[model samples]
Target chain A: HTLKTANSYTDVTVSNSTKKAIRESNQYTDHKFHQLDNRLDKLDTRLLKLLASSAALNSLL
Target chain B: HTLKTANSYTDVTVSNSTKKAIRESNQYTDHKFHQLDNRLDKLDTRLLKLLASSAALNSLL
Candidate 1:
């Protein structure tokens, strides 16, 4: 049944397969972001050592 | 032992404290990226609706 309604609305559009791929890539980005946390943790450890090196040098000087 | 061993080396340097903060924020980015995944999922839902609306309009024409 084709019925005309008096209502205002915004129009939007997108492609099917393109959207599927974008969603998949977004998932992958999420996974990689999670993995980055561990790398950051390792960087924390390394930075601790870096700070110690500074103090070690201070003692020598 | 400041033994000047006759060996070539690469000189790499980084600050101590700035590195600590960088590492911390990297972790935050990781967490936020996963959060973005959920947002992307919502986008996928919206896109699907957009596609259906297009088809509906085509039928109307």
Candidate 2:
């Protein structure tokens, strides 16, 4: 009985640790995605500014 | 002995599966980063084009 209980405990411990690791991995991926999203937004803003500047230059022409 | 062997096999299987899942997760993240990198490159090219046009307009002025 003692040996069986020990094995069971070991299995549960491993399962929990794996689950925790997966959760952390997912969180890390989510953070990366968030960073990418912000970068995209900044790029969009820059493009808009450039377009506006181009239009202003054309008006001068 | 049979029960012990079965537990051992289960442990190995779970560990292998967890490793596979982690590898796949990392691959997915890497793919996303690649996509973002390409997007950034495109933005850089567009910025260069806009700068060139702005310079041409200034030359006209």
lDDT of all predictions, in order shown?
0.47, 0.78
For all candidates listed, what's the TM-score of chain B alone? 0.48, 0.67
Best by lDDT: 2
DockQ of each two-chain model: 0.01, 0.32
Using Cα atoms with residue i matched to residue i, what is each candidate's TM-score against the true structure? 0.31, 0.63
Counted clashes in each candidate structure: 0, 0
Residue B13 of model 2, lDDT score = 60
Error of 1 at B6 (Å): 26
Judged by DockQ cut-offs, the docking class of candidate 1 is incorrect
Return the TM-scores of chain A for each candidate in numbered order.
Answer: 0.47, 0.67
Q: lDDT by residue for model 2 over B1-61, one digit each (tens)?
A: 8577657856786777589669867886787778788888888888888879868867876
DockQ agreement of candidate 2 with the native complex: 0.32
The pairs that clash in candidate 2 are none
Q: For candidate 1, give the lDDT of residue A58.
A: 70
